[PDB]
Each structure stands twice: as C-alpha cells, then as structure tokens.
Design a protein around this ligand. Sequence first.
Ligand SMILES: OC[C@H]1O[C@H](O[C@H]2[C@H](O)[C@@H](O)[C@@H](O)O[C@@H]2CO)[C@H](O)[C@@H](O)[C@@H]1O
Ligand SMILES: OC[C@H]1O[C@H](O[C@H]2[C@H](O)[C@@H](O)[C@@H](O)O[C@@H]2CO)[C@H](O)[C@@H](O)[C@@H]1O
Lengths: 388, 388
Amino acid sequence: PKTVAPGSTPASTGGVGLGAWISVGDASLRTQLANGDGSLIGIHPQGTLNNVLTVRTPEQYNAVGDGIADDTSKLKEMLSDINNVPETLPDAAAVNSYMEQVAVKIDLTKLYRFTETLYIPPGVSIEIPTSNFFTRECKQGLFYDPVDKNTAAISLMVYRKQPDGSYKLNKDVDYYPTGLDIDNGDAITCARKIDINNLNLITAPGVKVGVKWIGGAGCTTKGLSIGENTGSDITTARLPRVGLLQSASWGSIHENLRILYKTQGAVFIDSNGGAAVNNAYISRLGNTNGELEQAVYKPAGFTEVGDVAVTQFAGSEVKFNSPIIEQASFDFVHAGRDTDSYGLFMVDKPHIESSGGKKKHSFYLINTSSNVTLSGVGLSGQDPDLDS
Amino acid sequence: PKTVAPGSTPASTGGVGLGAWISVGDASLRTQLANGDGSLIGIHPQGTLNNVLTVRTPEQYNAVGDGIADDTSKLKEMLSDINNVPETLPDAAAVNSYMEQVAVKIDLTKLYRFTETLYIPPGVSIEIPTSNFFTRECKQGLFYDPVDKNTAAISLMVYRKQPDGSYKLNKDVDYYPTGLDIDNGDAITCARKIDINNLNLITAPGVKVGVKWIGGAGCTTKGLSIGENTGSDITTARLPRVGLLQSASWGSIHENLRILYKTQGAVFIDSNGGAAVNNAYISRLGNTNGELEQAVYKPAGFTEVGDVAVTQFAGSEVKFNSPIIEQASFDFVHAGRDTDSYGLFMVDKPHIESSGGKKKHSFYLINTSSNVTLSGVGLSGQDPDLDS
Ligand SMILES: OC[C@H]1O[C@H](O[C@H]2[C@H](O)[C@@H](O)[C@@H](O)O[C@@H]2CO)[C@H](O)[C@@H](O)[C@@H]1O
Ligand SMILES: OC[C@H]1O[C@H](O[C@H]2[C@H](O)[C@@H](O)[C@@H](O)O[C@@H]2CO)[C@H](O)[C@@H](O)[C@@H]1O
C-alpha cells in the first residue's frame, strides 16, 4: 500500500513516472500535455517532439509583439533563460566562463517594443525571416523606445575592472573598450559566439546609438538592418542618431549590413583587426539638413560639421568591400593611429550617390594611408571651392 | 441554470472558455487537438507549441511533391496565405503597402511541379536544405512545366501603370523595368524583403526564362540553382534558354548562384547599382552547337551568334567576383550606357573554361571601360583569326 499524507502533491510523494505516480484519465492528459515539453508526442522517423524543438521565441514568454506593449521583461527573460550573466563578477575566470555555455537560436517574427538597453549574452543566434530595406513600417524585429534617449538600443557585453579587482558590466553608452584595455585586463570581453541573421532594429527618434558591437571578436552578422524609412522628416523618423559603434571586434564579419541613420551610420574604433563589412548599404534618410549634423564619435582631427556614413579611427582597419553609401555629407572619415599612422583605409568599389549632388567629401583621410578602388560611381559637392 | 435552445452550438450560447463552456472528455480532446494550432501542447522552457512554429511548407496544403502532379494551386495558396497581393491596384500607395506586411519563411523539402509563372510577393524567405550542383535528377525544388514555353518560371512583382492611372502586375515574359520607369511612376516595384536560400529550379526544355529578378532592390539570394544536368543532349535537358534576367535591383546580392543554361546564363540590364554576384557557377550544358545559339536579351551593339553566359547593358554595373564560367561561346558581353559609356565592367578572377578549347570571346566589350583581374585561367578559341 501507498500512504499519502494530507497536503501532498504527486511531485512531493515520488514524482510522476514508472514505478511512481502515473497520470490517468482525460483531465490529467490535458494537464500533462499542457505542462510538458513535447515528450508525449512521437515524431518521424523516430523520437519525440522535444527532440527537435530547439528555437526560442518571445511568444513563449507571452510577448504581445505589436510594437505598442512594453515587451522588455519578456525579451530579457528569453535572453536570461539562454545565458544569465550577472552584472557584477568576482574575476576574469568568472566572466570568461559565460562564453563557454550552450548557444541557442532565437526567432523574432513579430514587433517587440522595449524600453531599456538589451544586452546580448554570449551564445546567441537571432534570426528573422527577411531583412528590412528602406522599410516604411517595421513589422518584425525590435523597436527601442526609452525615456532616456542618451542610450544604446542593443549592446554586447564588456566587463570593466573595478578598483577592488571585481568586474562590472558596462552600461555607459559612450564607452567602448580599446585593444589595450583587453590586453591589460582593464576590460574583459563577454561577447563571443553571437550570430545575427536579418535582425531588424528600429528606434524612437533621437535615440543616440542603435547597436553597440563592442568586444565582439569573431561575432557575425548577416542582413542586420537598422532604422525605419518612416517618412520625409528625418527628425521624426524611427532610426537612431548613430547606427552602429564597434570596437575590440577583430575577426568580426558584417555581411550586407543595412543602416538608415540621422547623424552617423557606422563607427569603428581601435582594435578591429581582420574585421570585414561587405556589401553594406548605409544611407542617411535623405540629405535635408544633412550638412548640419554633428558627428558624435569621431577622431580629434575631424572638426568639420556634417553627417558621416562611415567613421574609423584609433588604429581600426576594417575592410570595406563594395559598400553602398547614400545621401551623406561625408561618406568616409578615417584617421590613422595618432602615434604611427597605423590603420589602412580600405575601400573597394564604393557605390556613392547623393540626391541633388549634395556632398562635402567622400574620403576625409587624416594622418593615414589608403588603398581605394573606384567603380565609375561618385561625385563632388556643389561648393566650387571646398568640396572634393 | 443554463438554458440552451434547440439548434444551438457552444459558440452561439456563450463561447468556450472560463465562465462559459469548457471542453470535457476524450472525444473533445481529440477534436481540439486535430483542429487546433498546437496551443494545447506545452514546450520548454515555457510556452506552447504554437509559439515556435513559424515556417510554412507546401505539405500544409497537401501538395503531392513528386514532380508529376500539378502542385500549382497549392504553391499559390501557400504564397497567398503569406501576402496576397491583387493583380490590379488603384494607385502607388496601394501597391507600396504590400511591401509592409509580415514576412514568412517557406521550407521546400520535396519536388513541386507547377504550370504557370509563380509570382513571389514581398516578404518571403525560401529555403531548401542544399543547393543543386550539376544535379542529374532534381529531387527538391520547383519544376516549371507550362503549355506556353514563351514564359518565365518564377518572377518578382513589378506593377505597370495603366492609361486610367491604375497599376497592373506585369505578366509579360520580356518586360523588365528601367530606372527611368521607377523614377517615372510608369513602374512601381512590389519586390522587397525577399530572401532565397538553396532554391532549386528546373524547367521543361524550351522554357524561355528561368528567373525574372525584376525590381528586387535589396533582395538576396544564396545557392539559387537553375537547371538540371539531365543528359548529354542539351535540347532535351530540363533547363531554360535564359537562366536569369535582372533589372532595377540595386543593392541585390546573389551569393554562389548556379546556372545551367542553353542560350544565355544570366542577363543584367539598366539600374543595378551596387548589386553583386559572388562565386557564381554558370555553365552551358556542354558546348555542342553553342555557336548557333542566338542571344535573346542583349544590347544592339551585340550582333554575333553564340551563347552568352553573362550579358550586361544599359548602364548596369553589377560586380562579378570570382565567377566560374564554363562551355560558353561568349563568357561576358557587356555594353556601357549608349549616351555616356557609363557602367564599368567589373570581373575579379574569373575561372573560365571550355571543352575542346571552343570559344569565340571571353570579354566582348562595347562602348565601355572595364577593370578585370586575371587569375591565370583562360583561353582563346580555335579560329586563328577571329577568336580572342
Ligand atoms: O586615441 C584614442 C582617441 O581618443 C579620442 O577619441 C575620442 C573621440 O574623439 C570621441 O568622439 C569619443 O568617441 O571618445 C574617444 C575616446 O574615448 C581622440 O579624439 C581621438 O583622436 C583618438 O584617436
Ligand atoms: O536603351 C536601352 C536598350 O534598348 C535596347 O535594348 C533592348 C534589347 O535589345 C532587347 O534584347 C530587349 O531586352 O529589349 C531591350 C529594351 O527594349 C537596345 O537594343 C539596347 O542597345 C539599349 O541599351
């Protein structure tokens, strides 16, 4: 005989399974199925449903996915269930271990409004069926809509050494680690095994930075698409002031990156050895008042006023293969490393265009060398004296 | 008490749910499961089955998938359920709106025979597990088998203006929009947010055009594979005369495109700024009678006879990187724009080969400039006077 004390549960009196409690009847089947993992369902050629379910979705966490409801905690919970990285860690060994966990794929098929910077832990693949392209109304992806606009929508994890030898996750928008920081332990990257396929990210007007790709060595992107072609007034367009900011990401590859921006498209700083940006399509949403934008992250030698599609400095040498740059005051601003002019400006066959022939310079090169191959496409601006 | 009138249903007497009607028993469960969406099946770490099922297949529509039965209506239904765009539209706002719908991924794992041109609407991702490569018998993909061979197997959507001011979907096999048409309003593209991975397309012998990549700005492809390596006799092979025809597709990228053709491999016309074709493997199925093939779509300046692997004109300047071209009479035929010679012919390290050393010319250049990098692979024809 089996004695069951008052206040018992099947789980607390032997569990449910062979030799213990066995579910019987329809009510129990309903709950067994509803609270299971799919193991009750057989599949072909053999095995059970759970054996083949590996993707995660915000819907599993009840995200509304309409770009209205605040789905922040749902997205964070989804991320946490994959790899929950505490914001404070004791030492190097502790932060490094979070890059040695199981990686999981996430599929974003609706529109998720969020109001706090999302930090992607290592071991994450994010996918969306297709990439946005001058999309007027974003329907699938992330919509960053915070109270504090002096922030980034998305950011990789980089831990900063504290006075007591402990490490705290960086949450400062303007911060980016240097190759030196990574060498001397002042910063420790917690960004690895991250893959993006078609992530669409829109932003409330005025948000400072779209994506902070910091410390992402070996991390990859394909079809990453930033910004919304909301309307003619860029001042209300749902796109960030700065599309992407990248540092300490050697060996990182961005395939067919798409960026709709207001102030700066993409910025690459310090160590990014061997990193490539292929077939990028970077455009200011029209060039109205473009010449009045003020670059936010720029080398000291660049003091000119005007929007910049691509900015690079502090020894960064990203390879730009066949980029398409549109509607920019400055297509490229590049500075060699202050100390020795290190960092070759490499642009192969750029497709440069701007409505009404409005432009300041295509290649603004400071204390540097370069190898550029022209493809019979380009222009110089309307000022007969200053534009070149 | 609850009174239920004769001829009632649960829906007509309060609905199903808390505070109303609740399903009870095995029979109810069987029907709920059969007619549901997976919501009764829990999965890990939380949520239900419906939350993670996002991919569509033709099997959901009972397609036979054997390459014999005509699965046309079922492929069309699957496409329509994703984005059902009317063949006739009121104005531009109307057609533009269809590029702002939720995108869906389709997985093709069997062989689907169809008999009318398939029009891929915006917001569609297509994937097949692997790409065909000189495949003798196509097992997975699409097989176009029409009564009228003067047609295209697959086409993107471009709307043509009508005398009354309305717009109609183009169904003319030879039509392609120009940059001028798009600028005009004469044409409005409805091809955006389309991604193709490993799509295998074979066609009945005699089919004019395999794929009409028109207006596909920012659309991408990887492993698109056209044509079947049926047998030694090309007149009987399951491949089209013209593999791919592209126009108005600036920023479109074709990665590792594979084409087996009879007349012309790929054709690129008019505005295609910044578009790239990487590691294409284009080959006529042998060169037997290749010299007699007459190019269908080509510039006026080209009047020679012979098959052409790659044809480009009207100001199109697609970048061809590491293409592999085999058994062609003419590897490339390129004409700069009539008015100002615009449109640089760019080919980087082409791997050119032809059986028996049979060939007319590799680079037939008309009213144009070019930058070509040779990789120590190539040859010139057997005519000691004309071939170069
Ligand atoms: O030597 C490193 C780098 O330091 C300064 O860069 C600034 C930059 O000007 C700001 O826009 C922002 O991004 O912070 C950076 C340093 O944290 C110098 O101005 C620059 O020339 C130099 O390369
Ligand atoms: O000015 C554009 C273009 O017009 C003609 O191109 C023809 C082509 O010859 C045909 O094969 C077919 O594709 O229709 C095209 C447009 O009607 C000229 O022959 C060509 O040279 C010219 O660049």
